[PDB]
């Protein structure tokens, strides 16, 4: 997965949140590849030091960092408005979030499921209105990308908040696309299977707890991290340049069914 | 719309939300008319007794009423709990809420989007786990219906926080489908476009939205009605995890 | 179960193809039973009248019968007029229709795909175009419900031509619902998955192939006849007037994913 | 929209049909342009040579073409054979055809229908599986990629016979991707809204007869043929290794309802 060509993105302005761990560093190491400037958001100061040193050295990544936490009063607009301003616009929003609770539906706790609908719904939808806003003033158009799951599109067992709080952003992001579309910009999400993120082998390495979701993937086995990355960048390009109010799964053909 | 036979629902037990306003006293009536024994919950105590007279008068029907704010804490297991007990048991829970603050999403506010969450999504999917806790532990199955949207379903202007919080809690409804389908417990939603309730014909502009109805109009209450009330009933009892626009084919795009 | 209050068809002349046998014959039952009058056809002479004789005999229904082959060019405009003459018109038709070649992908045969075609997509849809220009003409409205299957919806190994008829007669049904609308026609779908039809049972039977299908739905069964009739008879009654264009899984569960 | 790094298909033998006209011939050109090898069919000669002479003086792409009707006994299976056979294996499917009689459901003609589903349905999904056959064969994977349409995802006035046979071949594509993903075989559809080719042009160019079409695009325009190239390139490239199953609309939200 190198880019070039059309999947360049020399000069393209791109916010990526939880951009420090796991799908979202991997989403800021493609971009950076690709030719991308970044703002970059995290919980973690020098994860976000290391971030920026990293893709300086290897890319001559333009790279601004925003260590903040999106459940923090006003951080959607602030969070919006700073990034903006970073480099006088934002051409690209990567909205990537999430956490897990996993429970039986009998045992759902309130706790745990107003945690994922914060982190996992309200705060990526605010940040894109505000973002989309932003984007509709300055008049260049451009592109959000939600990172999203195959269980916003097909339910799963002991994820009834999870898989509720993707539904929900994947169909915000299908409003952004019906509204901003005819301002030139295009909103779709990703929404990949498990992925093998170092988390990712941590929670699903087991082969007889992975064993059931695997046998419902056709090409028989997870993601890799690239291969979400691949499709973001894919989104953000001119190769995509119809693309607007899609759910791409990354998923091996598991949401058909 | 008379309900005989396989569409009577004599004994049921049936949990209907916002029951005194809007659709949710449409079903209430058809469920009444079913045969059905009510739990009816809202906010107004004075329209909760009047409810339960209105009812019984012109039914027969039994109808015990919660008065609660499911907005405090802990009032969705609350309100479940204190359904269950009424008559020891619930056969069906009628999900049904529904508020909207119509914005341009550039503008979105986001204490109306947080509002439309709490009401539209978070309360009835915590009544439904709980409801269904305790349709499992009773074991005599049981029909959870959410009134969701068309707006669940497509996108829709204006609507952000408004389709969002239904396409949630359409996605919530499949969790418990696939979950609790395993003890006998069937859980589908409704999907309707505009419904011309009193509070519906005074809203609704209309033409784009008429324009993408084949069938020229928008659905009245009882045709919301009609659907909850077969989805409850055994012509339903292979229907689970499933989606029901009553929309006149807007959906189909 | 039983058809009382709105769920009445008294009076309705209702075209049911396939109905000799299996869900064709259980919803001509159901139909019998609602009050509705009957046209039926099916290939042998033989096995429509033994339908006729049975209805009449539990029913006292009006049945008229056509013996035709449905694969046939010329079947679906003959069938369509032939149908429109025995009561002067139609409120309801049921468009069921079934051959099942199952074979894997790689093996798919020329012959048995195109016949699967011409019975489970092209006769349908011919015999639903023309009854629709009728139900038009007339000005009374009408309701088309398409029996097609879980396997419309969802890809099912083994069943490519199968798969693909039913998936296809999905859509014509839904162009009929577009352009037929306007005109009070509603046309709907119900996609059953497994029934237990006396065929059905014998087709599932085995253990090894049934365990997988029902792993698959949540309610943990097939569907027994009636379960696709219940469906049928609300998708023709005034209790569903204002669905068009639906497909209602008769399925458990199964098309979630 | 260039094809370089992830997006080059150096090396990769790759069938396109229909390549003479329309989008076929602008895929031709993009998989020629990223450097793969083509086996290019169609029903006129004059035009094929054409382009193998075009293509090789333009890129030094190798081309076999094959003059075949698909309409012939056993003539899918044929192309399969002598499309793989060419250059000893075939990496990739580009399962490309199309036409389209639109008439009212009502006044739909038998004929016209069935010359949609023979050259919309029939021959591509026929071809698709001895092609995946003899990919299953060879083991060295491979990705089909169906041009189908938005049409495809919603019923569309006056489209019957072609929303039909378009449905039917997205979902030929599914039950693909799911017998043949475990052989790490990808199936997966484009759907795209009008497409201004020559003929796209004129059939939609005037801004009275589709404006009630371009009011249901968010982004207010149809789609350019090399839009579809690019989402064609990309599924063909190991950017797109994790997607199978999926359909991507290039409508620029049309299908999002």
Redesign the interface.
């Known amino acids: 997965?190198?880019?070039?060509?059309?999947?360049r993105l020399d000069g393209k302005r791109a916010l990526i949140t939880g951009a420090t761990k796991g799908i979202g560093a991997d989403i800021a190491r493609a971009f950076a590849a690709a030719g991308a400037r970044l703002v970059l958001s995290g919980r973690d100061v020098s994860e976000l030091d290391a971030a920026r040193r990293a893709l300086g050295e290897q890319f001559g990544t333009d790279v601004h960092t925003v260590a903040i936490d999106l459940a923090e009063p006003d951080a959607?607009?602030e969070l919006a408005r700073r990034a903006a301003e970073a480099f006088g616009g934002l051409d690209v929003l990567v909205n990537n979030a999430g956490i897990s609770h996993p429970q039986?539906?009998?045992?759902?706790d309130?706790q745990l499921?107003?945690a994922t609908?914060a982190v996992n719904?309200?705060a990526p939808?605010?940040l894109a209105?505000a973002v989309?806003?932003a984007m509709?003033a300055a008049g260049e158009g451009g592109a959000i990308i939600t990172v999203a799951s195959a269980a916003?599109?097909?339910?799963?067992?002991?994820?009834?908040?999870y898989?509720?709080?993707?539904?929900?952003?994947?169909?915000?992001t299908?409003?952004?696309?019906?509204?901003?579309?005819?301002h030139?910009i295009?909103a779709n999400s990703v929404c990949?299977?498990v992925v093998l993120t170092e988390m990712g082998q941590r929670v699903w390495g087991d082969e007889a707890k992975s064993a059931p979701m695997i046998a419902?993937?056709?090409?028989?086995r997870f993601?890799?991290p690239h291969?979400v990355s691949?499709?973001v960048?894919?989104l953000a390009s001119?190769?995509?340049?119809?693309?607007?109010?899609?759910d791409?799964?990354?998923?091996?053909?598991?949401?058909?069914?």
């Not at 997965?1 to 999947?7: E, F, P, Q, S, T």
């Not at 916003?152 to 908040?161: F, G, Q």
């Not at 299908?174 to 005819?182: H, N, Q, Y």
Request: aromatic share 6%; with cysteine; net charge negative.
């Open positions: 997965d190198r880019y070039a060509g059309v999947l959607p607009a039986p539906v009998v045992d759902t309130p499921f107003d609908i719904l309200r939808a605010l209105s989309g806003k509709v916003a599109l097909a339910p799963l067992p002991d994820h009834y908040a898989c509720t709080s993707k539904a929900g952003l994947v169909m915000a299908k409003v952004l696309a019906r509204e901003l579309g005819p030139g295009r990949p299977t419902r993937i056709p090409l028989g993601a890799v291969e691949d499709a960048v894919w001119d190769a995509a340049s119809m693309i607007n109010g899609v791409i799964p990354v998923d091996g053909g598991y949401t058909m069914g």
